Amino acid sequence: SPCQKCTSGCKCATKEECSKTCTKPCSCCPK
Ligand SMILES: [Cd+2]
Ligand SMILES: [Cd+2]
Ligand SMILES: [Cd+2]
Prior knowledge:
The protein contains one helix and no strands. It has 31 residues and is mainly α. It binds cadmium ion (3 copies).
């Protein structure tokens, strides 16, 4: 489940950015 900034805004392209706004692969980050 994506945070309050990943829905229409998954700005994570690599875990280097994903691990910066999130803590894990929301329902949209990498898999
Ligand atoms: Cd997120
Ligand atoms: Cd993320
Ligand atoms: Cd995401």
